Amino acid sequence: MNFIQYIDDSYAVKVKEINSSEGFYINGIQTPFFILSVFIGNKRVTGVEFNNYDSLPMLSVINDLGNIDLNVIPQNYFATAFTEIYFNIPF
Amino acid sequence: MKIATITGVTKSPELQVTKAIGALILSSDVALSALTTEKISIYIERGNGSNVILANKVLLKDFILASTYGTENTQSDADNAMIALCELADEGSIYLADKESIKITLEDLISDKRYDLHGIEEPQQTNNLFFFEQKSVASEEFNKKIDVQGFDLAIMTVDDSVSDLSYQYSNGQVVKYLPFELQTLSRDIDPIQAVLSDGKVVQGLTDRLTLPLVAVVGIEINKSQGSIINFVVRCLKTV
Amino acid sequence: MKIATITGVTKSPELQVTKAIGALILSSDVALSALTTEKISIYIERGNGSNVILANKVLLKDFILASTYGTENTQSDADNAMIALCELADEGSIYLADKESIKITLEDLISDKRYDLHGIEEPQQTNNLFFFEQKSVASEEFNKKIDVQGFDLAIMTVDDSVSDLSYQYSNGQVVKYLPFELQTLSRDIDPIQAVLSDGKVVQGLTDRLTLPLVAVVGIEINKSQGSIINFVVRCLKTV
Amino acid sequence: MKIATITGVTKSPELQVTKAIGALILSSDVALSALTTEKISIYIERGNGSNVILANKVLLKDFILASTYGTENTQSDADNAMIALCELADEGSIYLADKESIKITLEDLISDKRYDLHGIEEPQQTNNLFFFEQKSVASEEFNKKIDVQGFDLAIMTVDDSVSDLSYQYSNGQVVKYLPFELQTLSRDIDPIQAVLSDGKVVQGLTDRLTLPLVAVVGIEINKSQGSIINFVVRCLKTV
Q1: Which residues from C are below 8 Å from B203, CB to CB?
Q2: Residue C186 φ then ψ, to 5°
Q3: Which residue is closest to B170 within chain C, CA to CA?
Q4: I need a labelling partner for A81 at 20 to 30 A (CA). Which of B48, C155, D2, D10 fits?
Q5: For D196, which residue in chain B has the nearest alpha carbon?
């Protein structure tokens, strides 16, 4: 079970599954979102990156393992809705 | 003042403006109808967070169309193939107190194209600012209703899969429109959209429509599956 | 909504409209300057009182030019070579109570051309209506004086026989103009009359002139014998 | 009424008009961009008193560009390659009291070109008139400051040596402008300057710039040596 934890526009934590066909990709959020964490095989992974989307803040948030505070990230870093994001997980 | 010039790279750096400006002049050697993917992002950094967002990765074509509606239109020269003056304040210019700065970023630029950004100063100060917002549809549902109260201008994408557009006004009346009637009504307030360098004039983009919203509280889209319909709405409010 | 599409016949069938439409959209593949004999007739049949005759066999060119004066102008697209939006009410739409209905017909068309009719509704209803009338000056008359009080716009056919035309205003002053001066004054209000498909604008017709009548209570025409002159006048009144 | 037609000669005679006219109509077979050195001088002559000088050897190009800024523009026909209407009073015709006449002179004309003059009168008489003044910045000097208080429109020559133009407003604020930004702002009010005969529209002149001044009390020109910078300002006042 591969799934991502992300916050919507209203700063609410939600979980969405990942489609593993022809790679790892996510789409159809329907709202501005900021990806928080990625889980592959019911475990937390680090060192992931996007091969088509350039966004340092989400990479920095994902790669850190400790608990984070949602009061430090502004609305600027939020990605636009209906965005196709691909994952490159090391293995 | 000359804010920046971008050539070669596919992404502009984080451009910072400190003095008070009220309008942005965007110039390029690429025509208005040839803009495909370039996006802009403008915000004001008030301090320890709580920054004010005026545009978040808004398409350049929609940003230009939503700001040059009315008597004015995009310009052309013998050196620049597209010039557009987009205002950011109602009457004067944005006011920064102690450390606020205006940060502007360009994304998805073309490698072999040139862009230039200039800022216009004003002798006045104001707190009424323009805000851009984006709305979309799931592309897997036939119809959808959105609320457009407060917004005074919208830019909608144009596709052959859109059948009906329903307008709900403040008095409760509901009026149904076809795309042809919508375009005809749109081209009745702003007959000319752009003037080319050679001398020809283009009266409308082939895949974008500008809708003025007066006393309109709801918009219903009746379409067919297979495409994503995008609306970019512009509003004015006090920060 | 879509009213009718005419193709092949030389006389459109009588068309009945029950919904309270506010304006008409005329679209065709014939250019605005290429219309020769097409005529329109619109009238409202009322079950309480008397029928209201808005247009009684008015030429299509004059009817289109009467409605597109000001900032609006007739446009064109890829499919349609001529698109015009003609208003029938002041601000709202025609009020129909129970069964009174609008009836529109087209006459003297061309077999190998295409015409369409579209209707535009409004959220509000009004009793202010637009009326079109025709005045004629015979071929054997050297001069003729007409009362244009209450009118606000006229369309005349430019002819070489017309020598002078005199306005008589409310204050009593009489001012004489030549055709060249009249055309120059007319083009100072609406510089552009239409936009073609290839991007070239046309600022006026070679055989039609549009005169805005502001605070004018009389029109005198002085010409030479040989040709007939036709004026198409527009007015607004509450029924 | 028609005033005069000039051809063959290089200097028009001092034409006298006794009828109270409100505006002039200038027509010629040369385009607005092709005017090089023609000059116009208009004044009001009193039999017993002091003359009223409106324009004194003002360039015809600057006169036309000053008088045709706004919604209108300069048009063209088959016979005439340039037609322009220039206002002399505010909302009427100049009032001649006892022994007043209007003297008009054209000088520095081309031998093989035709220049016509027409007069337009109004049913109202007013005391407000338009005055044209000329200012210059030499070529051997670097920067200059000119007081433009009381005026509402200026026309400046365009050269590739002007660096900065600074506006000082009525509240003491100082705003610096680049020539490109100033041109873009100027075209933001009047998108189109002239319409050609074929159909193409020209949105500006390569060696002239029109500056609408609102609540501006000072203009500072900063440039380099090499050319003379000419300004033509227009004002309205009562005589």
Answers
A1: 75, 195
A2: -65, -40
A3: C123
A4: B48
A5: B199
Chain B CA closest to residue C67: B188
CB C104 within 8 A of CB C40: yes
Q: Give the three-class secondary structure for B63.
A: helix
Neighbours of chain A (3+ CB pairs under 8 A): B
Strands D93-94 and D125-126: parallel
Spell out the residues 6+ positions from residue B222 whose beta carbon is closer than 8 angstroms to its own.
B142, B143, B162, B163, B164, B165, B166
Considering only CB atoms, D169 lies closest to which of B25, B76, B123, namely: B123
Pair of tokens at residue B229: 């319909």
Mutate which: B41, B54, B57, vs A, most A CBs within 10 A: B57
Closest residue of chain B to C20, computed from CA coordinates: B175
The dihedral formed by the CA atoms of B214, B216, B221 and B227, expressed in degrees to the nearest 10: 40
All residues of chain C having their beta carbon less than 8 Å from the beta carbon of residue B181 are 25, 118, 120
DSSP, residue by residue, chain D: -EEEEE-S-SB---EEE-S--SEEEEEESS-GGG--S-EEEEEEEESSS--EEEEEEEEHHHHHHHHT-SS--BB--SS-SEEEEEE-BSSSEEPP-SSEEEEEEEES--TT--EEEEEE--S-EESEEEEEEEEEE-SS-SEEEEE-TT--EEEEE--TTEEEEEEEETTS-EEEE-HHHHHHHHHTT-S--EE-SSS-EE--BTTEEEE--SSEEEEEEEE-SS--EEEEEEEEEE-
- In 10 A of CB C183, how many CB atoms? 19
Distance CA B27, CA B219 (A): 33
Q: Do B56 and A32 touch (CB under 8 A)?
A: yes
Residues of B in contact with C120 (CB under 8 A): 181, 185
Q: How was this structure determined?
A: cryo-EM
Distance from CA of B153 to the nearest CA of D (A): 19
Name the strands in the sheet holding D39-46, side by side, starting at the edge strand that comes first in the sequence: D15-17, D100-107, D39-46, D52-59
Tokens of B161: 């899969």
Nearest to D7 by CA among D114, D157, D144: D114
Residues of chain D contacting B, Cβ within 8 Å:
169, 171, 173, 175-176, 178, 180-181, 184-185, 187-189, 191-192, 196, 199-203
Question: In b/e form, how buried is each residue of B199-224, taking b as 16+ CB within 10 angstroms?
Answer: bbbbbbbeebbbbebeebeebebebe
- The type of residue at A6 is Y
What are the chain A neighbours of B56 within 8 Å (beta carbons)?
32, 75-76, 78, 80
- Residues C203, D201 contacting (CB under 8 angstroms): no
Sort residue C64 into left (φ over 0), alpha (ψ -120 to 50) or beta: alpha
**Cβ neighbours of residue C36 under 8 Å, at least 6 residues apart?**
none
Joined tokens for residue D167 = 């506006």
Which chain B residues are within 8 Å of C203, Cβ to Cβ? none
Which one of B168, B187, B197, B207 would you mutate to disrupt binding with C, by most C Cβ within 10 Å of its Cβ? B187
How far apart are the C-alpha atoms of C223 and C161, rounded to whole Å? 6
- Closest-CA distance, A76 to chain B, in angstroms, reads 7
Which residues have C-beta within 8 Å of that of residue B74, sequence separation ≥ 6? B32, B64, B68, B82, B83, B84, B193, B194, B195
Q: How many C-beta neighbours within 10 Å does residue C5 have? A: 12
B156 φ, ψ to 5°? -110, 145
- Interface with chain B: mutation pick from A78, A80, A85, highest number of B CBs within 10 Å: A80
C-alpha distances in Å from residue B120, one per residue of B26, B54, B104, B123, D36: 11, 17, 14, 10, 34
Would you tell me how many other CB atoms lie within 10 Å of the CB of residue D169? 17
Main-chain phi, psi angles of A64, to 5 degrees: -70, 140
